[PDB]
Amino acid sequence: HAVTVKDAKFIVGPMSSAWTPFDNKIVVYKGDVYNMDYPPFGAGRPGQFG
Amino acid sequence: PLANVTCRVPKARNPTVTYGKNQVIMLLYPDHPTLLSYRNMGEEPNYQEEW
C-alpha cells in the first residue's frame, strides 16, 4: 500500500513479527477484551459464561 | 420475652466441579461471604476452614 505525500511515494512494512496479543477465540465487553476459551454455540453450562 | 425460634438461611450456589487424579477442583463464585470447610473421612481428619 503506497501513499504519496508532497510528491514522495511512501511504502510501510511488511511487519517483522506476525505476533498478536489475541488468541483464536476472544471475548469483548464494552471496552475490555479477554483471551477466553468460551463454550461453543449450543453447548453452554448452567451458572457459567454462556 | 426471649423465645427459641427457627431462622431461615439461604444455600450458596453449587460450584463448578472438575475431577482429577486423587484431587478435586472447585470454582467458587460467592455473592456474599461464604464459609468453606473440608475434612478427611479417616483416622486423621485435618480440619481446614476459610471465608
Side-chain angles (χ1 to χ4, degrees), chain A residues 28-50:
Chain A
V28 190
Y29 175 77
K30 266 112 114 81
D32 306 298
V33 179
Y34 298 89
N35 263 340
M36 214 212 289
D37 191 34
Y38 59 88
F41 189 79
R45 298 197 200 108
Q48 287 184 337
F49 181 93

